Write a protein that binds this DNA or RNA. Sequence first.
RNA 1: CCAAAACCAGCCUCUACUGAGCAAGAACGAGGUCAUGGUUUUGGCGGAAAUGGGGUGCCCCCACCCGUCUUGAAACACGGACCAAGGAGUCAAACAGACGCGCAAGGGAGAAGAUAUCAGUACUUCUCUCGUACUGAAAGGGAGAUUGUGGUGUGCACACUUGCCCAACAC
RNA 2: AGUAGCUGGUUCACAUCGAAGUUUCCCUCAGGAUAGCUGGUGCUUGAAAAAGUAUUGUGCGGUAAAGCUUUAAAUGUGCAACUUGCCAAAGCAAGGUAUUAAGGCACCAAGUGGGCCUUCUUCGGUAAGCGGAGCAGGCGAUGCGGAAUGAACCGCUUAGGGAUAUGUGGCGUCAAAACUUAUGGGCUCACGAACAAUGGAUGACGCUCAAGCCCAAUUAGUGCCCAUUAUUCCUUUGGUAAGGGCGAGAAAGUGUAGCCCUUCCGAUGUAGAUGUGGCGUGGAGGUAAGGACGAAGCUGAUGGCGUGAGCCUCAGAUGGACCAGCCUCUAGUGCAGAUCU
Lengths: 126, 215, 144, 63, 120, 36, 192, 113
Amino acid sequence: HSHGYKCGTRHLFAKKFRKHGVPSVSTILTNFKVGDYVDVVADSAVRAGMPHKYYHGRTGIVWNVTPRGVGVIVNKPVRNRTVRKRICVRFEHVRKSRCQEAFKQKQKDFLNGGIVRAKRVEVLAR
Amino acid sequence: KAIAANKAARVALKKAAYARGLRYSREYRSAEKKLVHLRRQAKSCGNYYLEAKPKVAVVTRIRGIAKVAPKQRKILQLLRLRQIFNTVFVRLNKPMENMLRAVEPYIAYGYPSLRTVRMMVYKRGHLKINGQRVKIVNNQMIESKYNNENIVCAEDIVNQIYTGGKHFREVTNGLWPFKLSPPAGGMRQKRRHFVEGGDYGNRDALINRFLARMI
Amino acid sequence: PTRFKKTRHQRGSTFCGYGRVGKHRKHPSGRGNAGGQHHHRINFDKYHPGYFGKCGMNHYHLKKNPLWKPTINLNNLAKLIAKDEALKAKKGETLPVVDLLANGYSKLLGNGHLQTPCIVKARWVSKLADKKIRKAGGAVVLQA
Amino acid sequence: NHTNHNQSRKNHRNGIKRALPMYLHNSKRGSWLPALINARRVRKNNQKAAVKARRERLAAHKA
Amino acid sequence: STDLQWLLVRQNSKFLQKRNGIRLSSDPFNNNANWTKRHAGFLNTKAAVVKTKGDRILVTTKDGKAGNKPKSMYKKAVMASVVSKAVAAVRPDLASIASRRARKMASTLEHMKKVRAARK
Amino acid sequence: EVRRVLKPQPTNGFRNRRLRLRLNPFQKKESAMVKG
Amino acid sequence: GVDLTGVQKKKRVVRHHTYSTNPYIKLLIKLYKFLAQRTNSAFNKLVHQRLLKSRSNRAPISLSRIAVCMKRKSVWLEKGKKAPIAVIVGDVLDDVRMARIPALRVCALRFSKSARERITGAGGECLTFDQLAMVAPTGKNTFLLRGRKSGRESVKHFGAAGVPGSHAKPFTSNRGKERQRSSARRRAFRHK
Amino acid sequence: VKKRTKRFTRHKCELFPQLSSSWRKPRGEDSPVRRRYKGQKAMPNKGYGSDRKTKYITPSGFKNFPIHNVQDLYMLLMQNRKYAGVISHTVGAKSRKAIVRKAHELDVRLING
RNA sequence: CCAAAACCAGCCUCUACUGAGCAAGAACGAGGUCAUGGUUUUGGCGGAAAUGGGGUGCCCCCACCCGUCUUGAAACACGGACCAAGGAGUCAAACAGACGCGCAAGGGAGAAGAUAUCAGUACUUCUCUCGUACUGAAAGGGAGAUUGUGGUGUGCACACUUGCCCAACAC
RNA sequence: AGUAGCUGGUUCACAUCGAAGUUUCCCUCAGGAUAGCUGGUGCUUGAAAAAGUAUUGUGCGGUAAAGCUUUAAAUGUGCAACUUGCCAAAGCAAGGUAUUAAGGCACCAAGUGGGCCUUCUUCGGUAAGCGGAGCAGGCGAUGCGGAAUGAACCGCUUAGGGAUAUGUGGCGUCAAAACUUAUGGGCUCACGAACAAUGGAUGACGCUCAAGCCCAAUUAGUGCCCAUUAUUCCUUUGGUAAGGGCGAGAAAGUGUAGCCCUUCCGAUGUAGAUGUGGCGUGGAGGUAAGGACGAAGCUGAUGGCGUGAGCCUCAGAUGGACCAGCCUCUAGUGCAGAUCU
Ligand SMILES: [Mg+2]
Ligand SMILES: [Mg+2]
Ligand SMILES: [Mg+2]
Ligand SMILES: [Mg+2]
Ligand SMILES: [Mg+2]
Ligand SMILES: [Mg+2]
Ligand SMILES: [Mg+2]
Ligand SMILES: [Mg+2]
Ligand SMILES: [Mg+2]
Ligand SMILES: [Mg+2]
Ligand SMILES: [Mg+2]
Ligand SMILES: [Mg+2]
Ligand SMILES: [Mg+2]
Ligand SMILES: [Mg+2]
Ligand SMILES: [Mg+2]
Ligand SMILES: [Mg+2]
Ligand SMILES: [Mg+2]
Ligand SMILES: [Mg+2]
Ligand SMILES: [Mg+2]
Ligand SMILES: [Mg+2]
Ligand SMILES: [Mg+2]
Ligand SMILES: [Mg+2]
Ligand SMILES: [Mg+2]
């Protein structure tokens, strides 16, 4: 009866307790070449360029970097199909992914039962 | 010319199947005598023996195909348990143990005995061949299916689907899932877990009995 | 052929493919294009987007005969030139001549790679046609 | 009435079609323009050297 | 060619006798009246038949040499594997049947002499 | 020219004796082992 | 008593017999059905299935587009290798836009009277699938081709026009009827 | 040995004299017969198809083949152990005299000689 | 034709470990069976016999009147006495997709005419029409590449041990 | 022949697949359009862009519980496996030399757009066989077996049949099975055996060292019965499934009385879609044939054939003169139901 752009975001865009405040320099010095995976975790302290809501926590590749924004391609399940969305986003709202950090570690490295001689052994009864 | 070369092959294959299953018989008799020494060693040593865990379960769909949920319904398809008393051998990876845990009310399973493996592969064994469900009848039939110098005998198959195999997937996948008859003498309750006095779920080594009445 | 209608297939199936529920009526919506701006709005807007409105200047009593300017491209002048006549047409030599009114064409658009010269004879020409036609060693000669 | 019943069933009939592969409709277009324009200058030069490369391969193949 | 002709007359012809859904050939020159390309000899460049001719077996033949001259396209010859020896002389594959018809033509001829005589 | 290119009983295998002896040639050498 | 979920959806719809009434297609299918089965060649399997297609799905090819695709193929051929036969399972149409063409050896179901004369004016043979089978029983250096069908005016109509990504052609006897102000229009481009 | 020897009769033909016994597929949600309740009449289906090499074979063991005149008999001359001529109902008793003393001479069978 | 028995095949049924027990493995032997396959044998029946069908009755068993709209019909919901004849997606036209046919950068005629012999068939001029060019409100303008696929990506077949890539998609 | 978004009817068979009662929009709410679901047609090629599932790795979350409006589950959820900008600059950037499983795409189109129940979660309501949602499953559209009975409970889902074995449910009679089994334990005297008024309901009887209840069992300290289910066999049909082959037959074949054989998998189904050398009717172009030795029509314990629509034959102690087959064309073409005429 009232679904505006930020319906039901009372908890979703809340800052964590004692973790309020605008994004730091580690945020600002992160850089996004295109085709990078990213996490569209929206940060409330930054309001310009905030991701809708569905896109909160979604992962996707950057398809686009403008000076303050990171274009991100994020799949959305619409119905019988995953439409492939293009949210525009201020870079604060994009946390770079480690979604492939294991797999990159792999091609980094690509580059039974027996006698138990145990002696302590309490009875298990009630 | 080829007519007789078909003989040189059919003779050479049982020479192989003889040689294979002579090894498998020894690899059973030896592996188990060795596994008796240790548990027997340990009893002398006042000491327990942690038997090696099962590396293969003979999962059996035990409820019918009606009223099943989309998650269970998918896991059963990926187990290839699409009918009632279908059976498959699935080795017990954590990822599988978490699939089996998702559909246990729909299945009975346990750790097949070598004998249970023989009876299914010899009696109920069917290869997929050109998508055809083909009753095993020749070792010729098996070597053609499995273009694999490892897998020639029907004894090759029983070792793979019992020892846990390096080709446990290569073998069990080329088998049509087993179509067992309902257990003779009946089940107990396809609704309760086995330890509840029912049927579904892991029943450890006891599956061999249950699965014996079926085969 | 009445034999082939599915009228004839569904003789016996009581509702002729119109459904037991939701019965086959008459005009469940209006006649023709009724509700193009209402209950069929999603339909015209999806498929016939420009359908409603007005777009340009009127031309009262249009006369299309004066407007008649059919076009043939350089790339298609082999359709008019005889294949036999067209056989040897060096740019520095004699050329087939191709009246285009005779052949029913008025302007001469200068599309593809003409390479065989011809003295095309036409009412109109493209900026690129007379240029191409010259560079091939041919020549448009204006007529009316 | 607004029940969403039978919808995920009706939706998974033809599956949830998975999203298009990244190598397909990879249009830029609305990409930050200044990068996009320099990309044209390179791609156009890739074309002149691609064609120039094939002209080489033929002349090389006349032997 | 015959491959084409047969594909023309195949769905209908004077000779096709599709009765009760059964399909036999009224063709004079077919040996077992089976509506088949092998047999449809009226159609074939070469053909052979082993019909009776008043007590005698008759073995009409059609080497292709006559071509399309119907008045003389067929050449009769009155006359048990010998008849098959004649029929294979024109159509080798027809011979195995041409023998077996040529027999059954004989048992018919023997059978009817028994029947025609018994009709007295 | 065209001919040149052309490409040129037991059910129960566990209990049936001959079937098993065929699938598992060693089985009789194994059954001999069973005596005793 | 079987899960069948998703089995029917995997059923494919294929032609297994020609709908063509034409006798010659049927003698031509009679050949390549045989030849496709009795040979190991993948060429006979393509000529045989294409031969079973709709005349819609057997699009005609320009002789212009054969001369292009052929020389582009043959230009690389090592000296003393004669060019591949240019088989098409469809009609071959003359192209006014290419007056002079190479001595092609095209092989197709049908030729325009224009294609056949230009094809022989270049000295190229205009052979049928009959002697294609008799010269290349296997697809030995045949160069199987297809005519275009994307530029077909039927497919210009695919989709909606009103839908933003689309450049479908609306159905209209009247070209000026659904004409529209630049303001009111669907967005032309749209990312998928 | 036939699957079903009974006709698949139309539902409730027995109550309504006008209804022919000939089969019509039942329709109507509530039809006991198409909802295939167990006590009801059966419907025809592919599963009642007769065995396919005994199909069309009359108890004589012959497949019937229609015959109209004496020339037809030779259509059965060479396959007289497979087909049995059944003379058409409307050939005259005149002509049937001729078909019959000739169907006798040829060893071809006739269903109604 | 009805039987019965046999034979073969098939098929089915009926040690080990452990501390007397099992989570345990076969063997021997025997039985069953043709609504299993192949091998006959032996008897019974033979104007009738025999198998099949049909008819009528019974027996045991199963079985809610159909059509209907409806979430739900056996419904205390509607329509329903019998039968016969009749009775309901048609025709035109304009589009579209698909499929068949013809020709194809063209296709087609229409009206009409001229002829020969029959409202048909045969024949044709001149045109017209859809198309090969699109775009813009409009005045208007109007598309090849660096003797030839504009490039690139993925791409049958074939070729040669990678090339060319047809179509096709995408860029 | 006004119009009717409404009511009623809408006539052969068989085979192949088979829904929806939801989205957006509509003076829309008994209707449309739209999308989804479905069919048909393909196209394209064959672990392509496979997945209602895990595992592993990496995000997301703030509900239950907790807590006194804050920490925080489980179930979930995402993801993964040389040329030309920037920099001070040539370096950076950009483009170039586990299990299982055929993937994707297009086109056309229907029905549908009253749903219902139940599971769990809830919201509203005093409560309801109540209104509203979330999830999934069902009925609708579906039997069959079982709960005595029941749309949706239980089991199982379905070609025509046989053997075998089961599932839920049973085993005193009804009623198949403990011919009232146990060489089992307790408990019980009066009732006892999943989801206020016509006399009367553990289903009925009846049962009481049960034929009740809890528990365990299976011949006993040395089981049995019943499914449209499973398995197996036969047959059919389908496969745009896999192969082989080319005394009478051996057809290069989608489809027929299927060219033949072999193997495999499938089979339900309302609305709906489609197929059908599918049925059948009046007429036409053909072909072939029949008829006063009896055409059509009609009658029929006339059988025969076909899954079937139906065809065929027989017999008329029917008729009295026309007419079936086959391919092609055509349509005023198939009737138990319209308070139909
Ligand atoms: Mg939050
Ligand atoms: Mg039970
Ligand atoms: Mg349950
Ligand atoms: Mg229907
Ligand atoms: Mg419809
Ligand atoms: Mg409607
Ligand atoms: Mg409605
Ligand atoms: Mg205007
Ligand atoms: Mg509604
Ligand atoms: Mg085009
Ligand atoms: Mg109601
Ligand atoms: Mg155009
Ligand atoms: Mg109605
Ligand atoms: Mg179905
Ligand atoms: Mg209503
Ligand atoms: Mg809280
Ligand atoms: Mg709380
Ligand atoms: Mg019941
Ligand atoms: Mg009893
Ligand atoms: Mg069906
Ligand atoms: Mg009429
Ligand atoms: Mg009667
Ligand atoms: Mg009518």
